Ligand binder design. Structure first.
Ligand SMILES: CC(=O)[C@@H](O)[C@H](O)c1cccs1
Ligand SMILES: CC(=O)[C@@H](O)[C@H](O)c1cccs1
Ligand SMILES: CC(=O)[C@@H](O)[C@H](O)c1cccs1
Ligand SMILES: CC(=O)[C@@H](O)[C@H](O)c1cccs1
Ligand SMILES: CC(=O)[C@@H](O)[C@H](O)c1cccs1
Ligand SMILES: CC(=O)[C@@H](O)[C@H](O)c1cccs1
Ligand SMILES: CC(=O)[C@@H](O)[C@H](O)c1cccs1
Ligand SMILES: [Cl-]
Ligand SMILES: [Cl-]
Ligand SMILES: [Cl-]
Lengths: 222, 221, 221, 221, 221, 222, 221, 221
């Protein structure tokens, strides 16, 4: 029943480096980070999978406007990565697509979720993950944390096969607050993930350990 | 696990929104049947087909004695074999719900304006109870508090029944009902159709498209 | 799952309301049987018949010593094989409830005015505990608070017992007991006949009939 | 499910109240043993007999060292084979409790003035933990708060142990302890009597009788 | 259920307190080893023996790089076969914890100053997470809040991990961690030595003795 | 706006002894304790007044059963003690009496109060103090603390010229809980007051002060 | 605005810390006076001048009878004319506080272990009430809860008095008292020192200096 | 009534954002002054001019000793006669704040990482206390909690002082500080720039424009 922690990036190098340190469940991509990488899906998706040692889940986003075109995008994505999770923006056509994909047996995530009812609808349609945009919700004068709180309650009561996968972070604290509200998965962008490697108090505590050790013995080693 | 219903008799709307929303069914009442100009024997099968043969239908008895309500219920079931029969929760309605429980015909208790009235309908055997959220507000109560209390009462005192909240003017009313734990909900057309547009979602998707076009010169996968 | 009871000895009213309400049985007390002016050997089979041979019956012992109360319990059980014996929660009553649990005759602890007294009766073996909600109010206490505390005590510390709340002047009191978790209830006649009319529900049904008429020329299905 | 105890060494009171209260046993302590002037080998079997040969008994060790306390335990168990041994929660007492757990002799941690101390006694092996509610109050703290915390600590961190609350001046202290989840309790005689007999219950039974003799000219059933 | 630990490497003190406290084991850290002036291969078997061969031991790695930390873990395990390896939760420590999870060596994430950092160590595979309660308090934050948050985060998002709170100045800090749900705890010597004597307890036992000798001439049973 | 602590007794020697220790505002008598004292009102009441050194408020209960009889009793009590406060049990006739005595300008207390509504009624009729029987309410299965809480709120919102004067106590904790609920005055029975009279922990702290002082100066005193 | 005190009789420390800390004065007690090994007539003026003639002084009576406590108050006030006299809140101390109020000498009620005790000392006339926060904890209670209740009691029932919390092992205890509304406080030396230096502050000041140096080739102006 | 500040040394940005926002002034620190590459004597009057010659300026001392910081403050006040001097809340900074209050120079206590530290700075005389919200988050605490506690501490215990919260990554952090009561705030450039873009507002206005055009054939008044 462990939580799932994802990297929100398309940057293969960073995924390889951070995979060594973090207990990562996989990588979420979106069209903007794919485009930023400049490499097409059929190139970058296997590269990201390789960068995680072949383990973990990948997510990528459909691009078509109509529900049926979104199903065709899903089929292409799955032909690139057989067990990829298909992200579908939760519009009306997106809801139709999510229902179609549930009928086809292809796992989906409802993305670009700005409110709890919209998120719950995508889960009822069949999405196994629902991704509210926490920081984006804030920026249009709402509360991303409250949306995550409500959405998580609604999924657990009314669509219990789905999880919240919160996205859109500017600080580690936002992600902490989402987890404290029960949200069962999370995808962190690169800078937020990197702010979680510091803690100078830990460094000083290890330094005092070493000073005491090299002071009773003649060693910093064991 | 929750059941989302559409509160209409408009067969065109049912077919359109069946494509978008995860509908569990359609609830009719006398007023939307009438406004549809079509008799039960025509529009009930049209509704059933408009959601692709899956889905639950609900329709309201019209008689005013309990035995008359049982008669109405039998006619409705002969029109649609698995239909759920809405009985307004009056004294006679409670009698009808009791008799129909005996008959093995599933019932919903409708026109509920208060938590205890709703619980009674559930105790008599209704497997759904439908408080009128917005109408409760309109006589100076709180439809949300009635749904909250009714849900608690059903979950500990009549656990076979669900709240099926109805009567909404805004999507937020329905969201508040769901947050209070209400297990099913039926939405009128304009509320469901407000749950379709999201400007910020379209702006994010348009930005995705623009970035994709800047990098790959295309708009497609 | 909840048990709804009628608190009366009036046989004609039990007959009348057993068709409408979903009754689990009837509770009598000394004052109620004395208003009836028919002895326990008459009115108890009549009350049993007026519920269609269904539903449970409750009646109160009159003796003052535990051994006397046990004798009364055997009398009542000889009149109605499956009757539940009401015992006022005094010291002797507590002793009698213990004795009756040893005998295997189900009891209810009645005339409870405080949570601790009620819990003691449940621990003695009573299956139901009956606080007098309104009478507690009149002592300057809070019937609702006592019911709330008693239900928590039973669920934590005597889980084989249920609160069967009694003594009501308004439907709201009974609803408040049910929302506090109280698992059964017995209503006096007037409070039963205040939950059986709602002008808003009749107006709703009337508007439904008006639309049906204005669209099909009939008020029938 | 809850265990109610009497906090006394008075064999007459035990006989008389075991007929009325659903007692699970009797708790003795050195002061009440002394006040009875009878040694343990006399008064413990008297107490066991006054409970009708059922019931759990508790007695306190008197030794000051762990190993002496273990010897006191063995003495106590020779007097009453299934007695629970009360050990004051001092450092030596914690030692004794661990030893007695190894020996298979059920203990109770007594003279508990704080929640951490009580949890320690339960972790060492005590199956009951006995905070002194009123004494804690008298020292400037809150006995109810200590019972509340200790019960939470036991259910999370030593789930084989129960709180057995002791030291009471009013029935309300006992009730507050039970509402806080306390699974067992032991009452001193005066509090136990205040829990029997309430004038409003007697007035209610008297009015029941009086109008049972108004219609019907009788006293009985 | 709960696991109580001593935070020390003083072998004599461990042998002494293991007779009184219900210890689950001993945690060491590099400062406390150094202050003991004995190397690991000497003092770890000594602490194990001083606990009587039962009990879990914990010891900290010294390397700065993840691979060297894995090395230290193997060495520690050669000294004590079932020892838990404490890894400070840095980036390299997180790497070391993931590697050690792959190796099947149980780990504790130590030097934890915030809830998210601790949660990460559990996700990487640590079975225990040790926030420094008082050191968080000293830097202006709240060690109790960090423990409260961390416990919730582990119970819902990393359920195979427990909080093992460390760094205490008062018994009240440890109590508050346990009231927050903390499933294990490691106490420094002075703090363990302060929940070891209670004046009001000794006064109660002396009152017992006084009454007992006023009645039976003697003390002892 | 200091609270008022009263002693609930008519034992003159206990009043003199306990007034030395405690900051008493006065003494409340009732018929039972006056009877226990075996001395008529015209002799105990002046004795109690002097046992408080002349300062201090006195309270005594009427014995008559009709409103006009109670006004008579009140006039007699005021002839004994010019500024005595007249206690009136809150019955229907008691309420009529309190209205009449308000008209007379004679301060009154509504006593034998078992419910918040009853107590508020007595204050509305003109009582300046209202005395719920905390422990008697606890005794018959209710909550004297809740009754004090509700009564205090009612008086502050709806009868602000009146104060709660809580009575009937088996423990000091009941009294502290009344005070924490805002109750503005309290009358303590002898045993409860006497339990508020020693604390071993304080004596241990003082003994340790003395022992450190002796170790440093060999003196024990200043 | 708040009064922050130092809880010491170390003259050198008082002079040092008075330069850093915004102190309103110094509280002495018999233990710290004795540890300084100088009598009152010597050390009190030394402390006064170590605060630069500003600041209030507090000192404790030694006598055990009320008359003796008053006599001690007179000696104390002849040494320091505006000193506040600390009286331990015993029965005799309550008497002494009453007498000193009648004399017009300001008092603090010390060694308060419970909220009602503290309230009594304020009612008797004490301008300050000093609970022993950490010592209340060590007895198994909660010093923080005592301070909270006492502050509420003083504000509604003895408004001329302030809580002056004392007895601290951590700065967090002090902070929790101030958050509870505590209007004055007195810190021992080690807690006082912990409250000034924070490594993260120094790190931020160093980063500021480094940026300045990089942009201007200096660390000044 | 609340005071909104811009946290920058960028003279151009100050002029731009002065046009939009209701600024009360500008806070500088060493890092932003340094990043601007202009000495205090040059950039501080530039900033004053960019604010239209009104509003408050803040600048930080660089010295490490109280006496050094005081002379730094004198230099600052010679550049800007009414400037507020930011002093990092260390021990030396505390002494500096006390001395500067003696000198009548307004100060702000900066680099506050905990509520107690900040309160000390206000008690020493600082008119403003600046916790570093985001930096507190970063080291494992909660900057929002620190702001909340500090604001309560200042309002109860140092009412002449205001929280001036700083260090922000999002507008939400600042909103949460204001909702906790914090009375002043200083925003970095990018957060201030997120607070001037509102897509839904632009959409509503464009809809206004379109309706006005469809009715009057023009877009203006
Ligand atoms: C039973 C219902 O569905 C009603 O809510 C109907 O939709 C309304 C018309 C005007 C207010 S409510
Ligand atoms: C237990 C009952 O059946 C109620 O009728 C109750 O006994 C009354 C309250 C007020 C008058 S009678
Ligand atoms: C632990 C007990 O058994 C109680 O009886 C308690 O110790 C008291 C006796 C008298 C005043 S408090
Ligand atoms: C080394 C640690 O992690 C702590 O266990 C240690 O006990 C403390 C040092 C300063 C305050 S507490
Ligand atoms: C009327 C009073 O003033 C009370 O003292 C009353 O007499 C009590 C009975 C039991 C405890 S208190
Ligand atoms: C009056 C005092 O300051 C003492 O209570 C001192 O502060 C101590 C606290 C804990 C052990 S000694
Ligand atoms: C002290 C300040 O004025 C802030 O700029 C603070 O230093 C930071 C927040 C995020 C990165 S640095
Ligand atoms: Cl049966
Ligand atoms: Cl050690
Ligand atoms: Cl008396």
């Amino acid at each position: 029943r462990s939580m799932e922690l994802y990297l929100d990036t398309s940057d293969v190098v960073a995924v390889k480096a951070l995979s060594r340190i973090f207990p990562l469940a996989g990588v979420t991509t979106n069209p903007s980070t794919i485009a930023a990488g400049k490499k097409p899906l059929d190139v970058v998706l296997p590269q990201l999978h390789e960068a995680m040692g072949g383990q973990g889940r990948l997510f990528a986003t459909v691009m078509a406007t109509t529900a049926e075109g979104m199903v065709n995008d899903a089929l292409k994505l799955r032909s690139i990565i057989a067990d990829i999770v298909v992200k579908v923006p939760v519009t009306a056509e997106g809801l139709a697509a999510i229902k179609m994909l549930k009928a086809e047996g292809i796992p989906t995530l409802g993305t670009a979720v700005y409110g709890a009812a919209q998120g719950l609808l995508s889960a009822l349609a069949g999405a196994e993950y629902v991704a509210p945009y926490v920081n984006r919700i804030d920026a249009q004068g709402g509360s991303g944390i409250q949306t995550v709180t409500d959405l998580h309650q609604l999924l657990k009561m009314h669509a219990p096969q789905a999880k919240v996968l919160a996205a859109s972070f500017k600080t580690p604290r936002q992600a902490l607050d989402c987890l404290l509200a029960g949200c069962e998965s999370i995808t962190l962008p690169l800078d937020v993930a990197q702010q979680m490697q510091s803690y100078p108090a830990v460094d000083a505590a290890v330094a005092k350990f070493e000073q005491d050790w090299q002071g009773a013995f003649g060693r910093t080693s064991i």
